[PDB]
Amino acid sequence: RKMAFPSGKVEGCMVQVTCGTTTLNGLWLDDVVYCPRHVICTSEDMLNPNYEDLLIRKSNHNFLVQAGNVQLRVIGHSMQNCVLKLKVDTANPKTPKYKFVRIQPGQTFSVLACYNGSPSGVYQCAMRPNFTIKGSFLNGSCGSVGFNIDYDCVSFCYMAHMELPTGVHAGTDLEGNFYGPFVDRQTAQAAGTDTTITVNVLAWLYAAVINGDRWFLNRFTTTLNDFNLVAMKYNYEPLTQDHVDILGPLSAQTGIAVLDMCASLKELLQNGMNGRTILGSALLEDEFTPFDVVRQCS
Amino acid sequence: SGFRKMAFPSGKVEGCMVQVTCGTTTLNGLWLDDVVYCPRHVICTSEDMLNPNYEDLLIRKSNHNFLVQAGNVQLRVIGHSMQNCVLKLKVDTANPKTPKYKFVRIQPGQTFSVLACYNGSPSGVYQCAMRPNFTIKGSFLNGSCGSVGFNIDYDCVSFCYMAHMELPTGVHAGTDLEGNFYGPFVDRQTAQAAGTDTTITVNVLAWLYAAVINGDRWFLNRFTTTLNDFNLVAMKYNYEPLTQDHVDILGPLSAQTGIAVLDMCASLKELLQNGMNGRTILGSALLEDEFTPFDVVRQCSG
Ligand code: NA
């Protein structure tokens, strides 16, 4: 059971942004509303949008921002990469302590999903190696904002811009930089073949050991290079020395060296589960980071 | 790959979470209007928990024995009473963040979100179902201060669950907000264990309909089954029996897809026999049973 962060601090920041007939979700922090810049495009604009030119043709009156039933008056607009910044005449009184951060594939965060024009659900996820996010099967989302919470500080890391044909979404950080080889233009785009986040699977095996689920431990230890040869065969991400270092705390806590756990994982890949489960699951979980496990399993 | 279930946004409940301390025992309470609800075993020592006599423990308490903290603000308790297994502390301030709310008792198979507290504050939210054996599958639950379960329908929070105990297998058990336990469990540290759990068959069938609606059909077959034959097979896999009520409930999805309910039962029978052979349904390599017909009809009948 993966948990998301409590979403209340972000809920107070979700607003609806309308340009023409397009309405989508924006993030209201102090006196700025952040949203995908493609809100300014028409159907025909998307085929080859000149966003800088389209934006200068736009005026403050072209934007309608609503926080609940209160309209926010737009008093200026600028673009930062693929994110539109709408200066509004009112600072959000619910603005939490926050910062904008960029995460790496394999790292986890919570998504507050908007449906029918307001925040509707929250889930925990990992950014896939192919930079997409496995969201809800429900289509027609008005957008999504991804975040982590550390103490009282919300670290915003993701904003959804598009749905991909496979049921996943793709997006930017809050400075408008895309994650992955995607563009906010109407053009043929597909997620690349995805792979399993190996360092997270190892983190989760450590969680299993901490919770007393040990049947999969074996006496063997492999090498980083021998393991990666097997990992590649099974569409697992290569393990790096950095990953090994990251797992260090869990190795010290459990007494299972990383390359020792890698040999357990190699065997699980090559031979299967043999009718057993781990932490009650018949499948290996790759949406817990090492930091998630350390934090939740002491 | 599992099915991506969403929890309700937890903000409306976060505004109601408070800390309740009795002696050395601190746990989560729910502050609604001028009442704080929490498990009555907050008044127990570790010794008491084997055979607590709650009436005897409570008659000896005064209002000022209860420490209630809402953030860095201390709430003054001005009365207290016990309703079944829940303690109700009247405080001198109505919670200004109280949402529209009601208390409801749910049935096994129903879903709800859980706002989990850890280390003395809300720390995580997840979506779950009340299992057929009346337990909740939680997270790692290392040092939980409690949990509150809820649904949110049109800005009204329906509170349906409060966690009281962790059971040996890592699941938890608890009560409705009137303090009545779900299942045969008691708020006493004595040998009690969850019965064998079973899969929520009607939920799996609703989710298969959601899959067809969203364009997944590889698992359909040309067979049907009688209701009794299906139940004889399903129970061999530890699936819950399907009732005529369940058949009625799936009616709208059958009418939407053109697939008779007992035809979908034949498909489920075949999926249990074959597995998924490396394929997914709605992105999931597992059969999902924590998505109810109500939510499917709502999110897919459109
Ligand atoms: Na080993």
Coordinates of C-alpha atoms and ligand atoms in Angstrom, one line a residue, chain A residues 218-220 260 263-264, ligand 1:
Chain A
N218 CA 19.9 -16.3 -0.6
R219 CA 23.5 -16.9 0.3
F220 CA 24.9 -15.4 -3.0
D260 CA 23.7 -9.5 -1.9
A263 CA 21.6 -11.7 -6.2
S264 CA 18.2 -12.3 -4.6
Ligands
NA1 NA 21.9 -13.1 -1.8

